[PDB]
Structure formats: structure tokens, C-alpha cells
Amino acid sequence: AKQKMGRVMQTAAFSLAEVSYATGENIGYQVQESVSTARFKVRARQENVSGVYLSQFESYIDPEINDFRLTGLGRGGQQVQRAKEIYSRAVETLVELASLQT
Amino acid sequence: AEKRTLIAVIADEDTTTGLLLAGIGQITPETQEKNFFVYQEGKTTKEEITDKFNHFTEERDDIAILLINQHIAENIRARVDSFTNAFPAILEIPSKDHPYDPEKDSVLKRVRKLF
Amino acid sequence: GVYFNIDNGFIEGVVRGYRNGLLSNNQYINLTQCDTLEDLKLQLSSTDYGNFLSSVSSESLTTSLIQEYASSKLYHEFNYIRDQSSGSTRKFMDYITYGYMIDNVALMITGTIHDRDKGEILQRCHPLGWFDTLPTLSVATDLESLYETVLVDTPLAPYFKNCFDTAEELDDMNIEIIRNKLYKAYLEDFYNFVTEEIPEPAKECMQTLLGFEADRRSINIALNSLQSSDIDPDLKSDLLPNIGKLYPLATFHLAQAQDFEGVRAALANVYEYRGFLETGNLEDHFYQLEMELCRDAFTQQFAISTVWAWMKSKEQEVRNITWIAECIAQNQRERINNYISVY
């Protein structure tokens, strides 16, 4: 999953930069100002793996608001979807790492 | 602990932008803060990066994971001990401007050494 | 058109020579087979850009860096064209700058609602849309100060006084509302300007190309404004350019288009946009149409709109260069050929 997540991260970076190409200049500060609310989060969970209460966090995107990508060009939605898939993959990797440590 | 989104303190600017686009940051009206630190790679001091990493990993009480994507030595040195108590402060090494080689990955190094 | 060459003749000649420097499809193919970014610059030095990127080490080279440097040389040259001409053409090139200026001022609005930082915000401003009072406008301590300093001693004043009233800006989202409606005011003023003082055929080409840009902005607004519902259609109707060529018979339906079904029904009504949104990404279709109209502009030989055509063409060209550089640096070779330019 180290190389899998590296591949997925570079895919997400390409998608975001393609959205930037769609919207002229970089998403930059317009994207940065949308840090008011988080569209993705790691929900709390506890899975008893082999009798040990491992704290494997479960990724859960926010279903209430997704306005952080509502700006500029239409490719922002596709870029947000690619980045959300990448975030889900990375959250799975982080949950596996936490399980490994515990 | 309470759920939180992964921080990108030690990630690249592009990685931070991607995380923000995905929605991996939330505001903190209590102190005008945010769930993700500024990825000022090549501009912020190493001590500042270490302080931000400590604040996200020790001062913060939420369950936010962390991003160390191609992090500078300011985070590489800290990662030898920051992995302890991986909850609520988780750690990870995404991709960044520099390639995300597994050679510098502390978690991968520990996993290999345990073998 | 014989009076055109009274003063713009030197500008015309230099811009046509610059068109001679535009990148062709064959050298796009040549740049495609390149495998590494330093190989990309090595082959690009053979092109019009020359040794522009010889000041950076290979390890420090990035797609963002090459984007910035190519856009920087283009901006140097556009500023040269702007200050090497006077009169109606001078005002025309100012209006060309004014769109980037609108984007830049809208960016500066952020940073005033919340005052996190100023200097980096000012530096990261892209330099094409610069005007004199930008540094003064940057030290604004609140929305009010920017509001007054933008209504005096800057071309922002007419649009702001037309659209805003005593800085009622906090309630409105910048990018979705403050930026786009301001862009609309700019676009209406520019279309008007072309309609009074431009001569034929610059008129007959610039008016339809500006209408196309209005249509593209309108369609982008319509599609991006249906995911959320807090943009009420009356504001959406106001937000749409209200001038172009699909106005009004298509603009009205777009204003009342509530979903993707409504926008597909409305936009497909006009002839040259049928299936435009049905297949693929809007980026490719819209840029293809934009480059076709620019090529159309170049076909005319005496016309002011040749400078617009050239610098849109070069901007889209540097965008293609960035696309190739990114699709070779970030791998994913299956999307190299997305480049749009036709020359």
C-alpha cells in the first residue's frame, strides 16, 4: 500500500492540476479559503482484530456540505472526486498503520 | 476521541491544495485556527515545522491523522518518536513535490526492521 | 481598413511575427515523445521559447516553474506591446488586461474579509492584471478601505459602483458572486467599448469572440450553480453576462435551469453548442472553440482584435505546454494528446 498510495496521490495531484488548467490560474488561495468545513473525516471505530481492540479509523466523507470545490470551472467537481478517492485510500493506509502499531 | 480530518503540515503545497479540495480541513473559530497547517515548504523554518507538527500531534486532541509527504529533516527527526500513541495523532507519508521514496519512511523502516 | 496602419502598423508587424513563433501540431508531437522534463526543455529550446529556461537547474525544474517562466516571458512581451502603442489600441489592450485585473482584485478581496496575510497575497498576484494602486489596495485593513480605494484611481470603479453598494461584501461569497458579477460588469463594458470605437472587421470578429467568452462563462456558471441551490435564479439571471450570442433565448432557460437536465435542454438549443456538453470534458470543447475563433482572428490581417487573438492563443499555448510537462512529469502518458492548440 505504500506504492499504491503513492500512485493514487500522484493521480490526485494530476487531477487537481488539470482542474487548475481548466480554471486558468491555480486553485491556490481560493481553494485555501475553503478550509472552513471539512468534506472528509476519519470516523471513530474499534475492530477486535484477533482479540485485540484495534482502533482502526474508518474514513467517512461529510454528507452535509461539499461546497469547498464550488468555484471557477466545472472540472473542480472531478478534481474533488479524485482527491476524495485518494483521501479514502490514504485513510485506509493510515488505519492499517495504526493497526500495525497497536 | 472526536473524528477529525488529516492534517498536511509536513506535506507539499500541492498536496495541501489537494487535501483542501477534497475537504481535509476544518476551521477553528475558538482561536481562528484550522485543521491543516500551511504547507510552506521551502519558506517556513525547520523549527516552525517541528512546532506545527508537535501542536498537531500533541496539542490537538482530535483524532486527525497527519501527512509527512516528502517531509524535511525537521519532521524526519521527530518521526522517530512521534509515532508513539498513534491515536489520536496518526502519521502518514503521502506524495509531495519530492518523490515519496520508502527509504526515508519511518513507518516502513520500522516495519522492515521488525522482520 | 487603411487607417489601422497609421499607428498600429509596427504593433501589427511584431504581433504577426509573434504568431510566426506559435507552436504547431508537429512540434507538439515532437514534444510528446520527450520522456523527461529536462528533455522537454532541451527540445523546447529549439522552439520559439529558446534558452528562456536556462537559468534553472534540472533538479529544481518543475511544471509549475516552467509554467511561471513561460507566462513571465509572455507577460513581458504583452506589456511591451501595451506600452509600444497609444490611443484606441492602448485602451483596447487595457481592456484585455482588465479581465486578469478583475481576477486579481477578486483574489485581493480574500485576505480582507479575513486578514491572515498581505505580503504573500500581493506577491502571488499574477503580474499581467496589475495596476498602479495594487500595493495601496493591499494594505487595506477592512472591506471598506478596499471599497473606497477601488472606486477611485483604478479602473475597478465603474464596475464596483454599478454592482456593489457601500461594501455589502461579507454576506456574499467572493469567488461565486463577487468575482463573477464583477467579471460580468467588465465584460459588458468591454463589449460596449468594442461596439462603439472599434472599426470593421476588428468589430465583426472581436464582438463574436467576446460573445463566445460570455457564453463560456455563462455555461460554466450555469453548470457550477446547480450543484448548490443557494444561488437563486434571479441572481443567477443577473450573474449571467446578458450579452453574447446565446442571449436571451438561451440565457433565460439557463437562469431557470434547475438541474443538469435543464442546462442540457437550454444549451443544446443553440446550433454550435449541440453535444458540446454531452461528451467529454468542457475544457477540451471550449478551448477548441476558442482556438478556432482565434485562428479566425488571425485570418484577418488588418484588425485590432489580432492582439487579443495572439495573446489568448499564446496563453492557451502555454497551458498546453504545462499540460504536456505535467503529463510527462506525473507519468500518465495516456492523456498527453489532450492539447488543444491548432497551428
Pairwise CA distance, residues C207 & C195, whole Å = 7
Q: What is each CA distance from C278 to A23, B79, C167, C256, C286, in whole angstroms? A: 20, 49, 40, 20, 13
Q: Which three cell numbers mark C180? A: 463573477
Please tell me which of the candidates C110, C224, C331 has its beta carbon nearest to residue A29.
C110
C268: cell is: 443544446
Among B40, B92, B39, B30, CA closest to B61? B30
Q: C156-162, long-range: CB within 8 Å, 24+ apart, which pairs?
A: C156/C101, C156/C102, C156/C105, C156/C182, C158/C185, C158/C189, C159/C102, C159/C185, C159/C186, C159/C189
Residue B52 and residue B22 in contact, taking contact as beta carbons nearer than 8 Å: no
Q: Find cell 482565434 and name the residue.
A: C294
Kindly list the residues from chain A whose CB atom is less than 8 angstroms away from the CB atom of residue C281. 22, 74-75, 78
What is the rounded distance in angstroms from the CA atom of residue B111 to the CA atom of residue B102? Answer: 11
Mutant choice from A16, A23, A73 vs C, greatest count of C C-beta within 10 A? A73
Check C282 against A74: CB less than 8 A apart: yes
Helix axes C63-83, C88-109, angle to 10 degrees: 140
Q: Does A9 touch chain C (CB under 8 A)?
A: no
d(CA C61, CA B113): 35
Counting beta carbons within 10 angstroms of the beta carbon of residue C201, is it exposed (0 to 12), middle (13 to 18) or buried (19 or more)? Answer: middle
Phi and psi, residue C291, nearest 5°: -70, -35
Task: Give the whole-angstrom CA distance, residue C94 versus residue C97.
Answer: 5
Nearest to B18 by CA among B69, B60, B53: B69
Minimal CA–CA distance to C81: which of C172, C27, C19? C19
Angle at which helices B106-114 and A75-101 cross, to 10°: 40
Domain boundaries, chain B: 1-115
- Determine whether the interchain pair A35/B35 forms a contact, defined as Cβ–Cβ distance below 8 Å: yes
Q: Which amino acid is at C276?
A: F
What does each C-alpha distance from B61 to A26, A75, B23, B52 come to in angstroms? 33, 35, 20, 14
Could you say which of A40, A91, A94 has the minimum Cβ distance to residue B23?
A40
Subunit contact C332:A11, Cβ cutoff 8 A: yes
The gap from C-alpha C231 to its chain's centroid, in whole angstroms, comes to 24
C124 and A28 in contact by Cβ < 8 A?
Answer: yes
Query: In angstroms, rounded to a whole number, what is the distance separating the alpha carbons of residues A74 and A65?
Result: 18
User: What is the Cα gyration radius of chain C?
Assistant: 21
Cβ C66 vs Cβ C322: under 8 Å: yes
CA-CA distance, C121 to A92, in Å (whole number)?
35
Q: Are C306 and C297 in contact (CB under 8 A)?
A: yes
Do the Cβ atoms of C158 and C185 come closer than 8 Å?
yes
Query: Given an 8 Å threshold on Cβ–Cβ distance, is A34 in contact with B20?
Result: yes
Chain C nearest-CA distance from A68, in A, is 11
Secondary structure class of A59 (helix, strand, coil)? strand
Between chains, do A16 and B17 touch, taking CB under 8 Å as contact? Answer: yes
- Tell me the C-alpha distance between C233 and C215, whole Å: 17
* Superfamily (CATH) of domain B1-115: ATPase, V1 complex, subunit F (3.40.50.10580)
Residue A62: which of B14, B23, B95 has the nearest Cβ? B23
Strand-pair category, B33-34 with A40-43: unpaired
- Tell me, yes or no, if A65 comes closer than 8 A to chain C by beta carbon: no
- Are the beta carbons of A14 and C327 separated by less than 8 Å? yes
Cβ contact (<8 Å) for A21 and C282? Answer: no
Neighbors of chain B with 3 or more C-beta pairs under 8 Å: A
For C119-179, where are the alpha helices, taking DSSP H only?
119-123, 134-138, 143-150, 157-163
**Residues of C in Cβ contact (< 8 Å) with A24:** 103
Place of cell 526543455: C41
Q: What are phi and psi of A52, to 5 degrees?
A: -110, 130
